[PDB]
Amino acid sequence: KVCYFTANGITHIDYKDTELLKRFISERGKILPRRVTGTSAKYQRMLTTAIKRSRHMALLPYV
């Protein structure tokens, strides 16, 4: 697949940007693997810290 962040020229992921993050999480709230999404290695790391930060602030669910 294609990396969204590379394609759309997004270099920073905000944990506060819930709408973006919801696309990269499953229906159970599980973080999606980068194979399925097509996210790059560098951005899988960025996104994932953001999801964990968002879950801390109850913007996104743990489950």
Partner RNA sequence: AAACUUGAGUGCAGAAGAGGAAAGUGGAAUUCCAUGUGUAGCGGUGAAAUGCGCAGAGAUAUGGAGGAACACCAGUGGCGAAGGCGACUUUCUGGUCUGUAACUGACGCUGAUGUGCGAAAGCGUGGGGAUCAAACAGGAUUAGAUACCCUGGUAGUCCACGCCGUAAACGAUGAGUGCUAAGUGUUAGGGGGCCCCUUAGUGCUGCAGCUAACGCAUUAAGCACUCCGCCUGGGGAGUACGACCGCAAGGUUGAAACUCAAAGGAAUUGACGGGGACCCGCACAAGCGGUGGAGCAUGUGGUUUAAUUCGAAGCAACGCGA
Partner RNA sequence: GGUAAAAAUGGCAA
The footprint of RNA (CB under 7 A) covers 26, 28-35, 40-42, 44-46, 48-49, 52-53, 55-56, 62-63
Q: In angstroms, what is the minimal distance from the CB of 44 to RNA?
A: 5
Tokens of 1: 């697949």
Nearer to RNA, 10 or 46 (CB): 46
Measure the CA–CA gap between 60 and 11, rounded to whole angstroms.
21
Q: What are phi and psi of 43, to 5 degrees?
A: -85, -25
Q: In angstroms, what is the minimal distance from the CB of 19 to RNA?
A: 18
Tokens of 35: 């194979």
